[PDB]
Amino acid sequence: EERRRRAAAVIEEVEQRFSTPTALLRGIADAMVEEMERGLRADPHAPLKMLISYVDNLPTGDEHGLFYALDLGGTNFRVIRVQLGGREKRVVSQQYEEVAIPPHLMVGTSMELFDFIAAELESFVKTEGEDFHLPEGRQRELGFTFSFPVHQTSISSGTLIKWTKGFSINGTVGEDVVAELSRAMERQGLDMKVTALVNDTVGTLAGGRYVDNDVAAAVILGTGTNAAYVEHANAIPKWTGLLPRSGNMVINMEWGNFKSERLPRSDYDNALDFESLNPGEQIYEKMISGMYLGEIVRRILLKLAHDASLFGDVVPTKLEQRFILRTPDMSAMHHDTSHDLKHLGAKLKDILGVADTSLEARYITLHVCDLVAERGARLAAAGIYGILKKLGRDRVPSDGSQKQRTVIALDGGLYEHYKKFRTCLEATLADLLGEEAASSVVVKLANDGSGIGAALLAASHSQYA
Ligand SMILES: Nc1ncnc2c1ncn2[C@@H]1O[C@H](COP(=O)(O)OP(=O)(O)O)[C@@H](O)[C@H]1O
Ligand SMILES: [Mg+2]
Numbered sequence: 500e501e502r503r504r505r506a507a508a509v510i511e512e513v514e515q516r517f518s519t520p521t522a523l524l525r526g527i528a529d530a531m532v533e534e535m536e537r538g539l540r541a542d543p544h545a546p547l548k549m550l551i552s553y554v555d556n557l558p559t560g561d562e563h564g565l566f567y568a569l570d571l572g573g574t575n576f577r578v579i580r581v582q583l584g585g586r587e588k589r590v591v592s593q594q595y596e597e598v599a600i601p602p603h604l605m606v607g608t609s610m611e612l613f614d615f616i617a618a619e620l621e622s623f624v625k626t627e628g629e630d631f632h633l634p635e636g637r638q639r640e641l642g643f644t645f646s647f648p649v650h651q652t653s654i655s656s657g658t659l660i661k662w663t664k665g666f667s668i669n670g671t672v673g674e675d676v677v678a679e680l681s682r683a684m685e686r687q688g689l690d691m692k693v694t695a696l697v698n699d700t701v702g703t704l705a706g707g708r709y710v711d712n713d714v715a716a717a718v719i720l721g722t723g724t725n726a727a728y729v730e731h732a733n734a735i736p737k738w739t740g741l742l743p744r745s746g747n748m749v750i751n752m753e754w755g756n757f758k759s760e761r762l763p764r765s766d767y768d769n770a771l772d773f774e775s776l777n778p779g780e781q782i783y784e785k786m787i788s789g790m791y792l793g794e795i796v797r798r799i800l801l802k803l804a805h806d807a808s809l810f811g812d813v814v815p816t817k818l819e820q821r822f823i824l825r826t827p828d829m830s831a832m833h834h835d836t837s838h839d840l841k842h843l844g845a846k847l848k849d850i851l852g853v854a855d856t857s858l859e860a861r862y863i864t865l866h867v868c869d870l871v872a873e874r875g876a877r878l879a880a881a882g883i884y885g886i887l888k889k890l891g892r893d894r895v896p897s898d899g900s901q902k903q904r905t906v907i908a909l910d911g912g913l914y915e916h917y918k919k920f921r922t923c924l925e926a927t928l929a930d931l932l933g934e935e936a937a938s939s940v941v942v943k944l945a946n947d948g949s950g951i952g953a954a955l956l957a958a959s960h961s962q963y964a
Pocket of ligand 2: 575912947
């Protein structure tokens, strides 16, 4: 059919532009490290901000007391509460409540955002049961995870640099995010002090090390993507204070903003960025993250539907709608194994609004999902590889003796729930490492680990009382 060769040409340029041979991945990992060095010396125009987090001591286990945590949150926010027992007892009690963020609150007024989340924290502390005790006269203390880039000014204070992953609230850039929350808690008649402000990457790394001593980094793969790691404070040229007692510092790399001419981008990525909420920003994230994967698939399917009549001789109206194909929908289609792809086809009926689909159209769709998820997962593995190279963990002992154990905590709905994405991520990372080096790296799932991690860092920075 002519329509068949016209479809093969589209799929062929997708394969060509999206191609990520291991050799290219090593050059991208090298460029990541190059960019990490630029951000640590405060280079102008550095894509990676490499933010000092003021976390110089990760949790040890001896944390004790009662502490709350507020976790925000690209798609949801959760309020957490733990009773910490100490090196031997640990988390005696724990309670949490997760709430989905209404879509308007991502793009409205900052007072509406913080009023909404502070009101849910209010009704949450009001149900504080008897398993959690607060000594008399004392003030309840909070750990605040703020999943957006913040120029840190103390362990508990920081300026919003910019919004990401679907958020766009005027009037917060430049403002202290902890003061903005503190005011909202006050308007709710709520006695709490924020004693720790962390990015969700820094929090997951805190929560990860609390249960595994070898956690060296945290990678987030959810609605957005980002990563944090532990750096040597004497390896940060832009550091100007004293130097931490522990010689360590957690860095929020903000690696979604990574950009490199080595990144295999296409016209679909240019169009996606052009019509986005933050054009020109977060180039790397827009190839990896959950908010954008399904949208890349939709734009490829649209090209096919138009240039090859893939879904009929009239392009389906719904297919032209932006973000109509969410990434969990992409994930559902991708995992269909039935001989006729009946579940991929059932999903396509909802999302496209068509009555039916060719078996051949279903296999093309499955192939597109495959190419988009594969490129995102391989590039994310290249980023993790770059971190390991920064910590000198890409290689094993030369003296031939003593393999280290390096743990990387992973968090986010993409990694947790997109099976093909996760296994492609881990396979490529193991490929990038040697067979010798890979047996020393652990990818641990620490989902929503910034909740307890923010509570732990609020603990070690209490007032007290
Ligand atoms: N089944 C799935 N398949 C693919 N991606 C998913 C799936 N479930 C969730 N996700 C992605 O993970 C995100 C939710 O992850 P989570 O870390 O809880 O929130 P956020 O990253 O928004 O703070 C969603 O926005 C979605 O992009
Ligand atoms: Mg979640």
